[model samples]
Structures are given as structure tokens and as C-alpha cells.
Target: TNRPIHQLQELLRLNGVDEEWEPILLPALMTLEDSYLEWMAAGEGYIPPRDRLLAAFSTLRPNEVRYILFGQDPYPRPESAIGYAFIDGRVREIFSPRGLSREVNRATSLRNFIKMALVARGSLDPRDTSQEAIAALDKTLLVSQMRELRENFERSGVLLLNMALLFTSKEESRRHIRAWRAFIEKLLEGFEAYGPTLILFGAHAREVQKLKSARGLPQVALEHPYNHTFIVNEKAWELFGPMDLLLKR
Candidate 1:
């Protein structure tokens, strides 16, 4: 998909994607690069390694998903990072009972996020349920699990959009916000063709709202998957409408 900027025509050839798609993909990739650079120039500077962009690009598509869920940013650790192709390795070693000492930290975070998501959705007990599901989920093939959903949409020629929290508070989160917002804005601009559902996830719900105002795209802010406790974190329904249709046939 990044063929336009990095591999350009070559990637298209490898993927068997038509050149017509380049008109759509190339500019978006280029625009994403520009946004990343601009964010860096503003204040919070970052100098990613040579393969960083390539790694980020690699995370692009997952077996033709209609609904895209946006992640915040690359994990700080290179070996276990989501944007990297090797990121999957962290997931595997950590989740498995093999207990590879090298992958402990990676496994922990992975498990935490997944169990948190399920618990947030109320599938597990908030008190009694241990967060152990995180470990099990870390290695879960999320793209594979979403297979039926994607297939249904593809069969019908429909597209669903998902977005992650790319940015937080610039002045507050400092370097964190730059990457988050940079990725979000870049994805939003790049995926104009995708026409995704564009949901935002993160602890910074209000910050996501600010992003919508900034971009003026059809967007929504939901409670971060893990923030189920505290009055301050209570989900305001005024901020979200009914999602029963997602379970609709």
C-alpha cells in the first residue's frame, strides 16, 4: 500500500493491486509522511529508525478488513511493537505456555489489553475475573477472528471503518500526543478512500473529541477499553449512541 512512497509500483506488483489504486494509496501515504514530519517539527521531535516507516506501513492491511480499528502508536519496544512485522512474535511467545523468558514483558502488556477489552465489554467479571485473559489474547490472531465479519462485509461490498487514538495532549503528554495525533490524522487523511467507521480508543476521550473538531470528520469518542472504574471515567451516553445495530443481522 505504501508503494507510492517507498516501494511505489513494486509493492503494487507484489500485491497484485491495480495501478488505478495507486492514485488512491500513494497520495495518502505521502500525506501521512508529511503529517508525521510536521508534528515532529512543531515541538515534540522523534527520529524513528530507517525501517520505522516500512514497519508502520506493514501494519496497513489485515486480510481485507471492512472495519478498521486504529491503534495508538508503535510500541516503545522494537521487538514487541505493533507496527513492526516482528511484533507478532512478542504476541506468540508471551501468550503461549512455553514461557519464553525473553518475552515476558511483551506478553504481559498484550494480555492486559485484551482481557481489559473483554472485561470492559462485560464478558468477564470486573472483580473476580483475573486479567489472565490478556496473556491468552496476546497471541490470539485478531485478524483471523475478525474473518467472518470481514467476509460478510466483503460479500456485500460494504466497508466499516475503525480508528485508534493517535494523539493525546500535546502540552501534557508531550511526545506521546505527537505520535498519537500524527498517526490518527495521517490515517484519517490517508483513508479517505476507505470510508471507515472511524472510532477512537484511548484513555484520553476528550482529546479524541478535539481531534474530531480539528479534522471535522464524522467521528465518535468512546470510553477507553480499560477505564471502567471511577466517576470521572464514567461513559457519558450523550457522547455515544446505541450500538445495537452492530449485533444486528
Candidate 2:
């Protein structure tokens, strides 16, 4: 059988995407493939692994998705992309008292920020507020809990999406975002039918909010958790509180 040509076919299959939409999805996938190849040819450093590129779609199911956690792109660093926006595969190594390695050391601040938030939420607690203090929180326990939280979110209808699904550099992310715009719009059209609440966490994500179709959806725009100079930490803490409520409901 000549299956539909999609960059995400295997992932969609693995995640058990609705078979009924295959016809509707094929044309959009073809368009996305063309843009993806063009961008890939122009790239140099780290494009997300093929499986990870499907991160945004893998956990999503039509009619089941109620929340959208929008991001900008994959980590520019190699092997760190885990297909979930804002999550790195190396979180344990990065946040441990051993500190981040020279290679694969991306999202350190973001991880720390999340750790602190977890502690504040009482989901996590280190005995003290030192480097070792953070480390004292069981690495195995922390990692397991974070994974559980993500799984629970997926089960509860959280759609983890990004404005640009692939990346090599900041410049490439911008270019690819333009290339993938139409495909993203088409995907969003499907999501709109479900009336999911959109959560835009940064400038790039907020850009999508400007789309005429997106303006009416329930959404909250907050400062990027990674970029902080002002009171973004406090703001993110506040924003994430509601996320807990949404998850519980």
C-alpha cells in the first residue's frame, strides 16, 4: 500500500492518530514535506531528530485535546530534543549538582526555573537552597515525577505544540517558521474545531495569537520562562498555577 507521504507518518501511526483524517492530512503533509526538505538543505547544526519533530502531534488526538502549550522551536543543540516543548532529554544531567556538560548543555536556566517552581508547588522539595540542595532532591524521583506529570497532562488533553517544529539556529528557526506557516495554519484549523485553550508563552508563540482565526480562542500569553531579566519568574510561577488547576479538572 502506498501510504500517505508525511514527515510524521510513523509518529502519527505510533500515536494512533485518527485514520479518518489521513485523506484530509495528506495534502497538508505533502506541503510540509516540501518546506521541510528545503529548510533541511539550508541547515547546518542540529535539526530535531525525525521522531522528535513529531513531538507536537504525537500526544494530540482530535476532540480529546483541550489545552495547547505553544512553543517556538526545538532546541538548537543536538540530541537534547525530546519532542516535548521546553523539555530536554538531559534534564537530569543538566540540573544535577554535577552541573551541565559542555556539550548538550541547553535549557539549563529553564530546567532550574521549572525545578524551583516544582519546589514552590510542593510537588518537590530539596532539603536546602544550595546546588547540593537541588541535587539532594532524588534525581530518579524528580525525573520520574516530571515524566509522570507530562504523561498526565497528555492524558488530560494537553497539546504540546511549537510555532516552528524544527531548528538548526535562531535564524533557521525564523526561516522555517515562515516555510511551515501554512501547514501550521492547517493544523490549527483542525484544533480550532476542538476549541482547545491556547497557551502562548513567548514572543514567537504570541505571534500566532495574532492570526485572525486564533484571536478568538481561549488563550493566555505569558513571558517566556527561559528569558528572564524582569519579573518573568514570578509571572511564570503564577501562570503555571492555573495549569495545575486545568490538569486537575
Candidate 3:
């Protein structure tokens, strides 16, 4: 009931965020509310209501916000939390020999991947924490990864993929499509004024493709860093852009 900001503030305080930073950051947080409203307007296409989102952030602090991984909201779940996705973590697990522990690593790897991509594109300190890259990834992934992480975010983060709102047929993928487009636009607005890159890893390349034909900023496609294919052959470039290998190209 209109408690996200306050709860988020509590989280900030717990993490030792200064009072001064609160004032500066709170205004920027207004965009968070906008993101929620944008999701709400989607009607049947929506999952993870405002309360769920607030709770998600409340349960997960800014530190967890280190990356803003994105996917269509919520999967059919026996549990109630939203924001689930398979992502590289899943790719590293069951699908690859790296095992489940890599779930966390995959997430971190993606974060690092974004950093590398941004650096290649000339826009970030590789050592910076991953939150900003995560957000940019979310905005871009919604358009690219499509349904891949969708199954994971639901089953893994909060519940069973078969149980997410989409499984209920209560929502449409198109709703997510619109929400993602808006989210990316918002991300670009912020990035334009800041120092981070608006990332869209892997399949997200197609999402950026939908936006404009010509290149603006870098939208590098990673080779599903966690995919079994990448693991077997040590080929992160085979499925995605070979920025590291093809920098000369």
C-alpha cells in the first residue's frame, strides 16, 4: 500500500547508505514507481503486482540490486514471489557440467560480461558493482532472451515455471514486450545522463534490433556464457557476438 519507497529506504539504511544519499537517490527512485505503473497498465499481460515487486525489493536489498536481471514477470508457482528467471545460472546448472553453484556465478559473470561490453564500447569501470549493468540487462533482456529466462526467473527465484502467471494464461507475452520496451527507454534516459551502458546480452540483440537498424551504443550479444554449448567447446563467441575475439572486426 504505497510502501515501496519507505521499505526501500529501510533497506538502504540497513546497508549503511547515508542520509544525504537518500535525498539524492529518492528522486531517482521515482522511476521505480513509474516502472511499476507501466507494468500495471498492461492488465492481463501483467504478473508480479506492485505489492509483489515492492516485496521483492524489500526481501532483496540494494546489494542484491547489484544486477537488474529481467524476464517476463512471474511463472506459475506454488510460491507467491515474482521476478524469477533461469538466466545464465540455469544455463550453468543442469544444462552444463559446471553445476548449480554456477547459478550465482553466471549472474556475476553476466554482470562482468556487461562491464566488459561497456568497456569495449567505452563506458564503464570494469570494477564497478553490477547493479547498473543488471538494470540495463533487464531492460534489454526482456526484448532479447525472450522466454528462456522467463521459465527460470519464475521457477528459480520465486516458484515453479509451470505455475507463473503466464502458465495460467492470465497474461500475454506481448504485455511483457510492451513493458520491456518502456523499461529500456527509461534505462536509456538514465544512462544518457549517467556513466553506465544500457546492456542487452545474448538474444537481447534481437530486441535492440527491433528498436533501430543502425547502431548507436553497443548492444553486444553474449554467447549464453552458461550454455552447455559454450561449456563444451569453450566457445562463448559461437552463439553470440565475439567482441573479445572480433574486436578487430
Candidate 4:
């Protein structure tokens, strides 16, 4: 009766994926259930839980996407991974009086991303992106909740996708990526008619060479925000600056 394939189908619909794309996406999702989830449950063996595997899709309808930001994978922590790439479900407030909030700091990638955004917007100096520096910045126009970051990204028309839709063991990263290849190809092909820009971060940048559909789209290759270099990267600042991702809307 109920299976991961059905769950994905329903979730995809409920999340407002364009009707035209569902038929295209379901076959790819079905293969995932047949191969990957046949032996393992969606969240039982991996994480971000069963319902949230498509959380990125929920942020915007497929046709509304202007940018496809591909994260390498879901957050490894079950509670931290909420389906959306880079948005930590467990982190509440994004800022603390002392510095970046403790939870934000704990998630190093998110922390670095926030700093990168700050530097991108000229709110903080790239050379002094320390917690102490972040703590000293004026907060008048900033948004504080971690979830707001997701809203901002979505508002920016970004489809926050992860290369691998699920995560199990750290060593098994390549395995999961292989399983999701079909879904990635199907999704990218579906977007060909609209041709949104693809923002490939870190390994996804180079690994994108492996995806045939990726070559058809306009592309921006950036270091993953997890690295300190991302904080100072001039290109990153130029790309993210106009969006003002951290400001309250």
C-alpha cells in the first residue's frame, strides 16, 4: 500500500511542484524506491526524515526557480537536516549577543555561510569574520531566526538542492550520490525548458562535469560556504550581495 515512492509522489504534489513536472519526476523517484529504498526505508536507513526528502522542492514551484543551488548533501545530523540544503532545522535564533548563536557555530558550514553573507553585504569585514566580529556588527536590519534564512533564499528564487538527497554513513557518500544520479538528471532535464542558472558549490562545481544536463544551463561555480575561502571570495560576494540574504524582509 504505502511506500516511499507514493510518499514522494504525494509530498511532491503537496509541496506545489508544477503539475507538468510531477509525471517527469515520479518515474525517477520510483527507481529510487525500487533500488535504494527497496532494501532501506527513506529515513530509516538515512536521514532528514521521510517527509522532508523533498523539502527543497516545497520552497518554490519548479517553474518559479531562478537559481538551483546545489549543496553536496544533507546535514549528517538527523535533527539538523530538515530536507532544505544548508537550512538547519534545529537551529532557532541565528544570532547571539556573544557571537553567532551557539547552534549556528556548532554547524560550521552554516556558520561560515552566515559570515560569507555578512561579508557579501558589507556588514562584516572578510578579514575579521570571527565570532567576536560578528557579535559586534550592528543588527538593526538583520534577521535573527535560522528559518528566516531559508525564507530569504526561497524569496531569492533559489531552489536549494543537495546533490545527494539522502545521507547514511560518511563513507557511503559516493554510494548515495550514485543512487540519486537518475533523479538529478531527470530534474535537470525537466528544467531545460526554463533554463535557470545552476549554482554549483564546492565539489558540486567540479562534480557537475558528470551531469550532462548541467552543461546546458548558465553556471556559477563557487567554493562551498563550509570553507573559510568562501567568506573572502570576491565572486561569492558579488553573487550574493544583491540578494541581501541575511537582511530582514
Candidate 5:
């Protein structure tokens, strides 16, 4: 009744992925079998549990996938990793009348990404990315709701994906990432037909490129948006400019 692999297949099918994904994903899922069993036996639970771990795949069907914005891992805190990379579950809203919503402001990484969006949109001057500055800007067409923001990203075909789907602790971070290696390699190779551009948010994208299967896929490496410097990065502006990621929904 509770088979992880079977359930994973069902999840994919239910999410409209179809059988084609099974051939590409099975090998990757099996590699985590022993680790999952060991952890479950020891009373350890996976961060996103069973249902939400693959939310990105489920929400954005394969046909709609245009860009693969690869992230490092889930948001570290429990209940915070909502399956979509860069989207913090804990944050209910993205903006406020004064500035960024409370949860988003405190989320650190999310806050910077939002800041970069504002700067890219020409709403906020890169030289002055202060809260007060954001508050002062007009909000005619901007979306203040988190859900709207999520919808906006999805509609734009940005598959908010993470390299490592599970997070246990700092010590085990690399281990979990290693667990997904073959799957990513296969997925990259498999997705040659989809032809989506890869936006590497961290240095790890270079490492993934080393795989023969991952070779020749178009890749655009950008520093993690967690840094305030992202707000002023010319590349960030160029990549995100046409995205209109912060526009009203």
C-alpha cells in the first residue's frame, strides 16, 4: 500500500507526466531506495514527505517546461520546502503596502531574488535597494500575493527545480545531492528533445555539465540570488528582464 517507487510512478502519472518519465526516472529513484529504507527505519523522515517532493514536476507538465532553473536544494527549514525551488512555503505573501511581505523579507534568499526582480523591472534602482525604496515604488501592475507570483512563474514556463530534492542536514547535503546525480544526468540527456535553456543558479551546474549525458545542453550560469549583488548584476537583468517575473498576475 505504501511502496515508494510505485507511488512515485502513480504520482508522475497523476501529474500528467505519462510513462515516458518512468524510463528516465526509475534508475534515479532506485538509487535512493536503500537510503530511504535506512532513514525510515531509523525514524528519520524526508523533508518534503511523499506528496510534495515532486511538486515542480507535477505542477508544470513536461510540455510546458521551457527553462530549467536549477537550484541547490530545498529551503533548509521544515515545512518551508514547498517542492518549487526559490518559492518558500512559509511565506504567504510576496509584498506589502510598505515593502516585501514579512515572511519573504525574513527568508533572506527569497528576499534577494525579489529585489533582483524589482531592479530588473526598473521599478527599483539597483544603487538603492532599500526597503523604503521598494515601499516608495508604485504598485499599479505588480502582484502582491505569493500565489499570484507562483502562477506567474509557471505561466512563463520556468520550471522551478532543485538539483537535490532532499535535505537532512549540512553534513548530509552533499550526500543527498550525490544520490540524485545519475537521475539528473539521465534527465538532462533525456530532455534534449524539450530543448529548454538551463539556468544554473549555483556553481554546481558546471559540475553537472561534466557528465557526458549533460553535455551540449544550453546553459547559463548565474551566481545564487541569495547575494545582494544579484540585484545589480547585469546578467541577472538581462536574463530576468524579459521574464517580467514580478509583474501583476
Candidate 6:
């Protein structure tokens, strides 16, 4: 519980978070931690472990986070949800009934979206599914490229956040989303200090549209990448290129 305070401060320091805002952040985080603990004790079916529950906040700093990449909630499957919004843990063979290689199991829509963007940039092959080809691609994913791209982006930011911080079931995502409204509002207020660009995906994330505080930020609302739009555009980087450019610059 106390750890979120210290841990958040540490991440802020490493990423050059603004000094003016740290005082405001400290107490807000404590409040969130208290809320989380209360919810946990209530036995609301399930609560994500502390690490996964706060994963989104761990790497974030106010000034460092320039892009807010929002999602609906953590994946419902056990061991599938990583803290980062769109990122997931490594796909192991045991998770697959077919017992496919880890790399093959990792071929998720999110990964395919990234791969599609890479192909658009001529950085990867259109048909690159080889062990070698996929291996090369892996280096660009959140697991690999996070720090490199951050460093290159002028210590710029990308926050992988979710509407519902945690949920016992996928159907419960929106309920948790509603439950976390005030907490998420506090988070958006802090991010507002730096005027980070917002990228809201899917209808659930679109719910944030109701937050007038967030309405003013530069933002893009897009169909979720898992949608048919990915196959339609095939070269979907056209959709992602602006966000890519923001990170690159």
C-alpha cells in the first residue's frame, strides 16, 4: 500500500517528472491505494494482484507520458494480463492446446497491428512469420522496444491504461470502469498538467469522452485494432503513423 507512493515517486524521478506536481500526486496515490485495499477486502469476486493492478502507473511520470493509449480493461484470462494496456505476458506453449511455439501463440491482433505498422514503414516483411522474421519483430514490441523508443522520444511518453483497472470477468469490465471513475479522473487530472495527447480506443474507452477535463486534450478516437479495420487497411500504419511520429519526435 505504501509502495505505490514510493514506487510512483521513483518512476517520476527516473523519467524527470515535474516537481510542481509531486505533492499533489502523493496523496492522490495513497487514496487510490486505500480504495484498492477496501475493494480487495470486500471480496468483490476478485482483485488483480497488486503488481498487475498498478502496472500502468509504475512506468508513468507526468511530463514523460505524452501519449495516453487507453483500453477497456485487463484481459480476463489468468496470466494473460500484463500491466501495460495492450501488452501481454509471453505466450507459452502450455497456454495453447495445439501446443504451438511461443512465438506463434504470440500472434495476437495487437501484435499483428504492430507488425502491420512495421510493414507499412518497410521495417518488416509483409509475409514475415518465420521464426527469424518473428524474432526480429519481437524486438519492436512493448517487451523489447519500450525503453529504446522512450529514450529516442525525448524521454517522451506512452501510457497503456485501461478503463477498468481490474475485473473478475470480461462482462464486468464496464462495471469496474464505472467503479473506478473518480480514481481515473484523478489520473487524468495529473496527466493534464503536461497536456499529453490522448488516444482512446474502442467504445468502452470512449466513455472517457464524458470527462470534460479530457475533452480539451489533443486526441484521436479509433476503432479498436482487433476490429476488421486492421484487415481492411492491411497497411494499417496509415492509421498509426501519426502516433508513431509523435513517439519518434
TM-score of each: 0.46, 0.70, 0.38, 0.89, 0.86, 0.66
True-structure RMSD, every candidate: 9.0, 5.3, 13.7, 2.8, 3.2, 6.5
Candidate 3 residue-wise lDDT, 111-193, digit = tens: 34433443443333444424444334323222223133333222222221111222224456555455445444543343333
What TM value does model 6 have?
A: 0.66
Highest-scoring model, lDDT: 4
RMSD of 4: 2.8
Task: Candidate 4: list runs displaced more than 4 Å.
Answer: 1-8, 13-24, 33-43
> Per-residue lDDT of 1-249 in model 2, one digit per residue for the tens?
343355345545654465655543444455566545544434444567654565555555566778778777777667656667766655533343553222213554455455545555555443333445455555543433345556656776787776676776777677777766776677666666668878777685558755665755687776666653312355556656445521222
Candidate 4 TM-score versus the reference: 0.89
Global lDDT of each candidate: 0.39, 0.58, 0.37, 0.81, 0.75, 0.56
Clashes, model 4: 0
lDDT of 4 at 81: 79
Tell me the lDDT of model 1 at 174: 51
Which has the higher TM-score value, candidate number 1 or candidate number 3?
1
TM-score-based ranking: 4, 5, 2, 6, 1, 3
Off by over 4 Å in 1: 1-21, 32-65, 82-89, 93-109, 117-123, 131-187, 203-218, 225-249
Q: Sort the predicted structures by lDDT, highest score first.
A: 4, 5, 2, 6, 1, 3
In model 6, the runs with Cα more than 4 Å from the true position are 1-36, 41-47, 92-107, 124-156, 231-249
Q: What is the lDDT of residue 62 in candidate 2?
A: 66
Error of 6 at 231 (Å): 5.7
Question: For residues 75-108, what per-residue lDDT tens digits would candidate 6 score against the true structure?
Answer: 7755666555665544432112222245424546
Lowest-lDDT window of 10 residues in candidate 6? 91-100
Model 1, 86-182: lDDT tens per residue? 1333444222343222343344433333334344544445453343533343433322222332333343332232222122233434555453454
Which segments of candidate 2 are over 4 A away from where they belong? 1-11, 14-30, 33-46, 92-106, 123-146, 227-235, 242-249
Give the count of colliding residue pairs in each prediction: 13, 0, 15, 0, 0, 0
